Design a protein around this nucleic acid. Structure first.
Length: 577
DNA sequence: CGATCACGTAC
DNA sequence: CGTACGTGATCGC
């Protein structure tokens, strides 16, 4: 049982508590707080938010760093409280992050899933209480209050066994000194938001909508008929039945119309290039023009992404609503989308700094490959150097195509090399791709040793680890199905690389946030895109940031090879190039 | 109205 | 061949 409290009392403000500040809306930016639960040595309390969040003593308790709180997904509460002008401090245990570190593959997304890991089931899943999708609703106060108190009581009960296992895993510091501080930095980034030049976005959509109608009309002529070009089904009928184009790849229901397939068909018919062009144009229009405009706040013209810190199997962040980690950059036409991301104050600028080849640098370090490490110590172009080695030529004799093929091998090596997936990438045979890989491993025998050893370790221990002791369990490493076992071996190879690079940029972010405060700079972190950080800052801070940000990022850890950071700034994200 | 499947964008 | 997220179509409810 529990107290359904009319008033905040002093015994609710003990210096250690499990705290529930319930935000049911999936997107928590400026969202309602539907209820509060406090469990401490003195009892269990449910508070209505309109009462508690107006009580100065409760608010002061929330903001007191010395009053320690155990929570689940504290960034959600912190951000929702930021939008009410209320500061949340003292969060010393985040059960979501603790569960994520212990085993990211559980998909732990609510208190009940984490509690099940320790045989605790006296709490319902959020989806049972709130329902799903259309039927999603906040239940009446008695049902609501019991749920929130059960969650807090679960958090209260679960802190000790989770911290105990984290210690056994040598992951206690990972939680307390990396993920939990990073959660506060992400809350600040999300709350700040990124300012969007919506008028520029709208005028892009207007010229895109002109060009879409042009290509669209040309497509119907060359097809001799109108059809929904966006349907892979109808399009496959125009292409592979009406126009008789060769079927180079079947899907499961019909024929593949992926861009890769369409590349090969363009010589046979003028329609294919137009469908390609229609597809690129339509991708920008629907996902990056219309998509972005839908999530801009009309008052501030900012987008406030949500960084999912407890989701990827490797330790990377993900970004939602909008995803700001996949804004186009490769093709110029899509890169112009970044012109719409602008500083949020006048006479400020966008500063962007990115690690140069952090994954291959991490690989050099963990493999202790003499050749690969020397290449980075010489700051060589790694793709050209790999081509020189694989194809046994001097630098002068590396052709553009050789470099392109060596680059693809370098990507495969990072992702988990296999004869078949490189062959696919390079449009070559499997025996040919196997010869490339064999020649890579002859040139980098330390990388070969590392790939063999880490697979054997994943089989022996049941998991692989990263630099800062993140882990990923790989039960499929022992499967007797070749496809399933191979994916697990590739994950054994890739996760220490991708995950270690994630560890490093997360530590950089923490170190950078500390340095910016020490230096009293107004510069603020806005975004992280896996190996780059995006800031905005007064124009008068650029020269100091040119020195400060790359140094903090490069010194975040010490590897057997240097870390190298490139950096640029400009009046928009596009210009920060 | 979910939910699957293709597809495409980033790193 | 790694890791994500969003959009559109399409099916069956």
């Amino acid at each position: 049982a529990f107290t359904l409290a009319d008033r905040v009392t002093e015994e609710m403000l003990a210096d250690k508590a499990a705290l529930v500040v319930e935000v049911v809306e999936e997107n928590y930016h400026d969202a309602p707080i539907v209820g509060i639960a406090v469990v401490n040595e003195h009892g269990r309390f449910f508070l209505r938010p309109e009462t508690a969040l107006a009580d100065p003593q409760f608010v002061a308790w929330l903001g007191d760093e010395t009053k320690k709180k155990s929570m689940f997904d504290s960034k959600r509460a912190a951000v929702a409280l930021k939008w009410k002008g209320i500061e949340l401090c003292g969060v010393s245990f985040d059960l979501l992050l603790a569960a994520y570190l212990l085993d990211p593959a559980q998909g732990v997304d609510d208190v009940a899933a984490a509690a099940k890991m320790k045989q605790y089931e006296a709490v319902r899943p959020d989806e049972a209480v709130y329902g799903k999708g259309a039927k999603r609703a906040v239940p009446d106060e008695p049902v609501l209050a019991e749920h929130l108190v059960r969650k807090a009581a679960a958090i209260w009960a679960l802190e000790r066994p989770f911290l105990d296992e984290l210690r056994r895993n040598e992951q206690d510091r990972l939680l307390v000194e990396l993920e939990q501080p990073l959660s506060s930095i992400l809350a600040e980034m999300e709350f700040a938001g990124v300012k969007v030049d919506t008028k520029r976005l709208e005028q892009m959509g207007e010229e895109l909508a002109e060009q879409l109608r042009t290509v669209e009309q040309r497509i119907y002529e060359l097809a001799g008929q109108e059809f929904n070009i966006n349907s892979p089904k109808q399009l496959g009928v125009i292409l592979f039945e009406k126009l008789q184009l060769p079927v180079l790849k079947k899907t499961k229901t019909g024929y593949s119309t992926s861009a890769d397939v369409l590349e090969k068909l363009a010589p046979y018919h003028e329609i294919v290039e137009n469908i390609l062009h229609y597809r690129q144009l339509g991708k920008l229009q629907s996902t990056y023009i219309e998509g972005l405009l839908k999530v801009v706040r009309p008052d501030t013209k900012k987008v406030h992404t949500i960084f999912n810190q407890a989701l990827t199997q490797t330790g990377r962040l993900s970004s939602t609503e909008p995803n700001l980690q996949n804004i186009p950059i490769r093709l110029e036409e899509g890169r112009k989308i970044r012109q719409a991301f602008v500083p949020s104050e006048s006479d400020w600028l966008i500063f962007a700094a990115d690690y140069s080849q952090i994954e291959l640098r991490v690989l050099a370090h963990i493999a202790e490959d003499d050749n690969l490490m020397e290449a980075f110590r010489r700051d060589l172009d790694i793709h050209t150097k790999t081509a020189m080695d694989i194809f046994q030529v001097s630098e002068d004799e590396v052709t553009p195509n050789m470099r392109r093929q060596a680059k693809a091998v370098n990507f495969g090596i990072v992702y988990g090399i296999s004869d078949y997936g490189l062959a696919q990438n390079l449009n070559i045979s499997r025996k040919e791709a196997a010869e490339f890989i064999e020649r890579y491993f002859e040139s980098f025998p330390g990388v070969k040793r590392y790939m063999e050893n880490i697979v054997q370790e994943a089989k022996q221990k049941g998991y692989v680890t990263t630099l800062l002791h993140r882990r990923r369990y790989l039960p499929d490493i022992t499967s007797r199905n070749f496809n399933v076992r191979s994916f697990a071996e590739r994950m054994a190879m890739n996760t220490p690389i991708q995950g270690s690079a994630a560890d490093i940029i997360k530590k950089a972010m923490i170190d950078l946030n500390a340095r910016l405060k020490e230096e009293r700079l107004q510069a603020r972190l806005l975004l992280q895109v896996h190996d780059e950080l995006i800031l905005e800052a007064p124009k008068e801070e650029m020269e100091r940031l040119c020195r400060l940000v790359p140094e903090v990022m490069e010194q975040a850890v010490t590897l057997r090879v240097p870390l190298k950071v490139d950096y640029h700034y400009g009046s928009t994200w596009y210009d920060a190039k």
